[PDB]
């Protein structure tokens, strides 16, 4: 919606060359995707239409018992189209020139997502997940579109430009980003990855502790910091560099299956726990880090495991990683 024609060209060029296994055999993903393109230089008033087209198509497929994801890139462009039509109409401007009915339109559009039981028979269940990119003016999340959307949606993947300029991708701002589905997902994890939420919370706690320690350091420097604080900062840097940072245009990190993600969380939190345990038992963090740089490098390089190698093989090597890390942390601390 109101975005580059080149972005539609690359989708059309790439999707035919990408294959999925959802049906049991390799088949181009283009076979199960539809595109609705209203480039930024196409008629502005059509942007709204495109959005309403997309969701409808999505809903249609949800009526067939399929799980559809409709991607609105970008909804800010639809809001801008509404603003332009409103300006040509001489209507009273709301915040930042937008029409007073923008928030209601966004809320109604987002209410069309959901898991549902199809209308007719035989009974079948589908879902529509709306994923909408928001383009705040100036990068400021005070934008009316962002303010309405965050009021509507349940997941907030907020991106940081200072991370993107650094090539830290995805540039999710972990401080502001939130998901309100973490509670309903417990069931899933309890059936598949039972200690997934615990590790997620451990990672978030480590990241928050590091964020505050870094505010302290920026003014006071990395001195008067307990070795535990040094470990927290070091492992948060490790997580940010090698877990939260995923190169989407590589053969290994284009896709990270949930099991590889879970094993990587296990490895990073195991590193943190081993370091904390070793230092708490009299070990010195500087010397211990010098001695276990090899373990640190193995944990960081865990991201290079090819998911195409299979769940069993990757899990086996992650278990080898964990055992080697335990052995080395025992060796380096007597």
């Amino acid at each position: 919606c109101g975005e580059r024609g080149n972005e539609m060209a690359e989708v059309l060029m790439e999707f035919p060359e990408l294959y999925t296994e959802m049906s049991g055999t390799k088949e181009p993903i283009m076979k199960r995707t539809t595109l609705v393109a209203n480039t930024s230089n196409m008629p502005v008033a059509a942007r709204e239409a495109s959005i309403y087209t997309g969701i409808t198509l999505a809903e249609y497929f949800r009526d067939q018992g399929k799980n559809v994801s409709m991607i609105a890139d970008s909804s800010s462009r639809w809001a801008e189209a509404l603003r332009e039509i409103s300006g040509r109409l001489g209507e009273m401007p709301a915040d930042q020139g937008f029409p007073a009915y923008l928030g209601a339109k966004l809320a109604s559009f987002y209410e069309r997502a959901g898991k549902a039981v199809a209308l007719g028979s035989p009974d079948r269940t589908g879902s529509v997940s709306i994923v909408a990119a928001v383009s705040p003016a100036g990068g400021d999340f005070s934008d009316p579109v962002t303010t309405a959307t965050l009021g509507i949606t349940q997941v907030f993947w907020g991106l940081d430009k200072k991370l993107a300029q650094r090539k830290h991708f995805p540039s999710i701002n972990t401080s502001v980003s939130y998901s309100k589905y973490t509670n309903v997902l417990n069931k899933f994890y309890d059936s598949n990855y039972p200690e997934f939420p615990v590790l997620r919370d451990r990672m978030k706690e480590i990241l928050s502790n590091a964020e505050e320690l870094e505010q302290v350091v920026q003014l006071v420097g990395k001195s008067a910091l307990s070795d535990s604080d040094k470990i927290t900062l070091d492992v948060a840097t490790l997580i940010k560099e090698d877990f939260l940072q995923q190169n989407g245009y590589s053969t290994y990190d284009a896709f990270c299956p949930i099991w590889k993600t879970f094993d990587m969380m296990r490895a990073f939190i195991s590193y943190h726990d081993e370091a904390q345990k070793a230092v708490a038992n009299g070990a010195n963090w500087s010397k211990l880090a010098d001695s276990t740089g090899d373990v640190k490098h193995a944990v960081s390089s865990s991201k290079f495991f090819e998911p195409s190698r299979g769940e069993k093989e990757v899990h086996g090597e992650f278990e080898k990683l964990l055992s080697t890390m335990q052995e080395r942390f025992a060796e380096s601390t007597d």
């Binding site: 009273m92 401007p93 003014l219 006071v220 420097g221």
Partner: protein, 51 residues
């Protein structure tokens, strides 16, 4: 007298640098941002009133 004074001067110089390089620029950026946003709100209200 030397040890304590060296520590105190190190801390004081670090804090002077923190003030003049981290806190003051940050506060100036905040002031500029707030001024620009308030000017934007004033422009919006003025032009809505004019309309």
């Amino acid at each position: 007298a030397f040890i304590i004074l060296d520590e105190v001067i190190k801390v004081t110089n670090r804090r002077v640098n923190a003030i003049e390089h981290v806190i003051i620029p940050r506060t100036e950026n905040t002031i500029a941002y707030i001024n620009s946003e308030l000017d934007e709100l004033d422009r919006e209200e003025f032009y809505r009133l004019k309309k």
